[PDB]
Homo-oligomer: 532 residues x 3
């Protein structure tokens, strides 16, 4: 087999052919194709620039580096979320603005297959594109799968709240990667006219943000947010960000005389220096002691007036923006195992009481943002069922799982619906065999669990039962169908009701059946409590 060579604006790319069990046409794969100029030196904390064109044939045949992040934390999430047999270790580097392509098309002739661009999660602090192999998806549903990478942590979200460092560089990288798709994907058998953006968690939030940004208008045609939206305050830094900026500057050892001075100084530091600072800050771990409101937050999406002209809560109440089919969905136990574990959540006992509950939730303020004078009312409505200390822990996890993902998600879907745009919702409730051993077997539909079915882990890994194997096939159909027509339906698949007034949504799992009114009670209770 002679390597697939594609011609792109910036030059030619050389890839490799990989065949998948049960498919005639081997999939053409490309790794580490640059879509932007390396954000080094003076390019740090600025919008991504076009990639410099190359003279000969570029070998897109080596997994690219994952943006600088906590290597330990990074590699772990890669392992837990990956869908490939063996996990692929990755190197760090500021030089990370790359994207991988998986095309099943026969490059020998013209092809305009729907394109699906994936934005990985990791709370904007960690993650990589290489973690997800788009082999199965491409072959199984005949779509072009593109996994993109974007600036994380300080490198992609540091903001002085002014024109010296607006922020949201990570998000600008996403929009930059999307343009590349529009100008080149046709060379890989893709249809720049049928691009669908889908991500999980932080990636879900990103898709949520892009669906709102005037900078993305016309860059995609359908969107999927998996367990993550923009109303999810945790990732969106509203209010004056200046204070957090100065805090970072000082930790890195810089004067805070003026914004421009901070930025200039941070541009002076080395990758290693910013990483150490990144770690002293302990952004991914939750601070137990101290004041709930003080415990340093983090850094993420901001309202720069470029990507976002205003907070998401506001924007969504404005039906004058360009709309597109939008699928929003959550898992059964978003806060089941994964997240708590990675945050080192205080759940050693496996039990709880009305007191600790009101105490853990308060300290969990940097996550669920709940006023202390509200703590009780909330703690009661949930943990008031039985007296079982164990039944309590579980309801508490639901409590949180509804605040971060449940309520926000349904709300977003509602508004999008009311906006007059095609909307679909779903609740994934399954337990993949590819779960971690340290995961209690009772936890079903945990954070990220649907990833294995969406990316077809069953056709790359081992031990998947016929049930699981078919659950995956089923899901890819849905996703691919949506990608094709902005409607998940297709012959041979359960019927997926459109999310309208009836609020019909689809429950996916062992038995995939349609239902209605998702987290309706939940949305109600919280819409009020928060209104104080």
């Amino acid at each position: 087999s002679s390597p697939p060579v594609v011609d792109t604006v910036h030059g030619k790319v050389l890839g490799k052919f990989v065949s998948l069990e049960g498919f005639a046409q081997p999939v053409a794969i490309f790794l580490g194709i640059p879509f932007a100029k390396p954000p080094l030196g003076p390019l740090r904390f600025t919008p991504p620039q076009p990639a410099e064109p190359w003279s000969f044939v570029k070998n897109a045949t080596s997994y690219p580096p994952m943006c600088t992040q906590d290597p330990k934390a990074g590699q772990l999430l890669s392992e837990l979320f990956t869908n490939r047999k063996e996990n692929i270790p990755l190197k760090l580097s500021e030089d990370c603005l790359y994207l991988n392509i998986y095309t099943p098309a026969d490059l020998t002739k013209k092809n305009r297959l729907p394109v699906m661009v994936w934005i990985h999660g990791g709370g904007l602090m960690v993650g990589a594109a290489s973690t997800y192999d788009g082999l199965a998806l491409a072959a199984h549903e005949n779509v072009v799968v593109v996994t993109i990478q974007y600036r994380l942590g300080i490198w992609g979200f540091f903001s002085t709240g002014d024109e010296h460092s607006r922020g949201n560089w990570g998000h600008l990288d996403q929009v930059a990667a999307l343009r590349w798709v529009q100008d080149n994907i046709a060379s890989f058998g893709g249809n720049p006219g049928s691009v669908t953006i889908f991500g999980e968690s932080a990636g879900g939030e990103s898709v949520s943000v892009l669906v709102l940004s005037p900078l993305a208008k016309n860059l995609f045609h359908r969107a999927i947010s998996e367990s993550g939206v923009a109303l999810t305050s945790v990732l969106v830094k509203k209010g004056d960000v200046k204070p957090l900026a100065e805090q970072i500057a000082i930790t890195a050892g810089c004067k805070t005389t003026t914004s421009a001075v901070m930025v200039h100084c941070l541009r002076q530091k080395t990758e290693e220096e910013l990483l150490e600072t990144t770690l002293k800050m302990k952004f991914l771990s939750l601070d137990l002691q101290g004041d709930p409101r003080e415990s340093q937050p983090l850094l993420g999406t901001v309202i720069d007036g470029m990507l976002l002209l205003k907070t998401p809560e506001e924007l969504q109440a404005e039906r004058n923006f360009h709309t597109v089919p939008y699928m929003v969905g959550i898992n059964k136990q978003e806060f089941g195992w994964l997240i708590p574990m990675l945050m080192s959540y205080p759940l050693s006992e496996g039990q709880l009481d009305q007191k600790t509950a009101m105490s853990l939730l308060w300290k969990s303020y940097p996550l669920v943002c709940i006023a202390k004078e509200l703590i009780p009312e909330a703690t009661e409505k949930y943990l008031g069922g039985t007296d079982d200390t164990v039944k309590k822990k579980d309801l508490f996890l639901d409590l949180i799982a509804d605040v971060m993902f449940g309520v926000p998600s349904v709300i977003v879907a509602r508004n999008h619906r009311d906006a007059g745009a095609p909307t679909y919702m779903y609740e994934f409730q399954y337990r993949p065999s590819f779960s971690s051993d340290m995961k209690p077997k009772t936890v079903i539909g945990d954070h990220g669990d649907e990833l294995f079915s969406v990316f077809g882990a069953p056709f790359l890994k081992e031990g998947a039962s016929e049930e699981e194997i078919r659950l995956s096939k089923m899901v890819m159909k849905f996703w691919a169908n949506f990608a094709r027509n902005g409607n998940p339906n297709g012959e041979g698949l359960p019927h997926w009701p459109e999310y309208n007034q009836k609020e019909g949504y689809l429950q996916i799992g062992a038995n995939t059946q349609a239902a209605q009114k998702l987290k309706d009670k939940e949305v109600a209770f919280w819409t009020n409590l928060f209104a104080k």
Copy 2:
């Protein structure tokens, strides 16, 4: 009511209201409006670039930092020159290209008031805009007052004598602020068609230079120089500047292989390194020992072929330019106390003698630039009056003051008059009650004295006598009048004759009246003596 918000070209700015005794309408003050991109990193030693526009409302409510300078000397000059009750301490920074705006207009309606841009002095080595509060002048004369800052010392005047580092960055910053005003001052109630530039000392020197530069052509319509002009040699380096550049490069710890190499190296130093380098050169103090003519330079205005195409001495006796009304003035005793006190001039005796005189006057070369063979003739002229060891000390001061301000000022005036453009002269002779304690009472019209009257110190500070209050109301009317018509005269004021052929000028003080032939005698004497 509500804080003032003006929309400029680069975005909206938020100011603050301040009422002043006897004025209904409060003055809208704006602090720290950026008129240039912070000259940091590679931008060091290069022309000023346009400021980047901002997405929301910018708060122009804090005093901006002052450009890097001797923190010690800076605070001292500010306290001595400030027209306000309590001196405002400042921060040092390379990010200092800001300006403050004081408009007395009712921003709720259209207004086109005359505009006066103030350029602070400080030997191009120290100074700040914030030192001068425009609240009084704006309220009392109904004009917009704009105080600007420009790079100082190494940062704004370093020159290799060639294209790798022309120099005059500071003057360019000044020209830059005039362009900002031309494009934005209307949003603050100003009339871009009537901008008057004025400054004292180094600032007066700056105004003079701008009057001779093609770069400032059409950016101002009137000009006033308070005790300082172009011929004021000391601030205008002549000959090869390369040697001084190298002296500076070595002190900072750089190579000196080529001009490009020097500049490339200093560009890499840090603010503190250049600040500590500045402190070592001791530009401010006068060296008492070693050979006089050698004594260390100071950097300043240079003939770069961009701002000045030749020496002021050459440009005046020449080109058919675009002239404008020009007001040039000096004080009664320019070297009476303030300057000598700050240069630590050796006069602890309170007396001098014909011999010591010639000794001092020769060591004072870096200030007067008089050949040693001329000294006796010159020394004799002034000190040859009587034998009093006191009357000598004083006459020696008139000597210095005449060579540095008196004669140069009148020559300039004449040259301007002869060019055929309105010309006015004045001589301020009054001892403000806001003078420093350590200042003998025998001094009148010391350096900087007319500053309290010009910016109405009597209306901010305390204790002004009715006579001092009046002197201020008067001077301001004159300035403002000149700024409106280009003629100081107006009702309720003594007649100020034009500096035409009769060489009439205004003697300002407790008793203001017109006179003729200011310094005529000296100009003559020094023209021959200097002609070897």
Copy 3:
């Protein structure tokens, strides 16, 4: 009598006049005219850029700095090759993109004399333009002599094989200077339509490369390669260069994560650091210990896709480029002393034997590149002669000279001839009197020996005899006749046949006369042996 002053595109240059022995027309000399912007900071490893225009008159009267290189080796080569009486001490700097002009034309009147641009040699690692004084040649043949410089070693040839650092900066520097000649030379009395480029060794290789470069088409009209062509392997690294980059990267102490990462780290290193890295490398010295092949050669000309689109080998077989009169030549004893000396070749005992030869040959791999399995046949061909162990050393020095210069050189001329363009060859067989003392009198026509005749050492240095003087004059006529008409012939000169199918070449020395089939037998052997 008054300093010459010519106006160039970026400003005025002030030179000096100099008179040679009996010439009435003095020669104007300009030293250090910049033809590009100092390649500092980010400009490192990037194509040369235009120079910044200066404002007044620039004094071109000081030897510019030679580009960073080994100061020991650099001084040494300059001392061995200089044709001036006293050697000129030089300074090192990244700031070195300058050229020197020697024009015999009367600047007061129009003048379009032929232009001869000289590219110095030095293995692309060392060398400087100032070594070569153009006074004699300029006066003696009435042509304008131009000596140019270009980045060396790491600064001028570091390549990552991709767009982040293509390479050949040094060759691009040469092309830039040529463009500078085209736009200015006329101002110096030179005809931009008749520019001849000639260089020695590495400078010879450069001339050969410009001859095949699409970029350089139209920048010259005649070319002379003296002991060095593009086929001279040792200077053109084919294959993947990425490794040598990683090696340099690591030695300089830089991560090797990605090309962009490497390039970015090296740009951050100080000139001094990169020189230390250059010394650690140990390029100019042949390594005896270790694997012959692994013993890294150097780093030089690469196929970037901008200056060269394919290996010289492939390019020559293409008669579809621009063709011009090309003179190519070698010296009787190319490897007779200078080269084996500067590299510390193990030949002290002044003799060799078949075994030590085959073994020596294998170690010299990074010089003549000879598959180990070939050595015996090769060594048996040259050393199969007498049993005289001393003759074997000389014949071994022929073996090498042939593979590095003789053979490659003839093949080029032939290929050029066959492409349909005027070709001329020669063999210099003479021992200049200006040879180092440590050079055996039996070595005649050693590497670089012709330089003394070409640049007329006999008319600047002492000791030359009537015969050497006569030789120099002769050679200078030939070189200038070529520069004039693309034909070395002229009245009063031996006939120099054209290198057509008969393959006539000129033998230069004490007895200069025509001849045929130079190296004919040797090329057949090596072409055949190398066919593997």
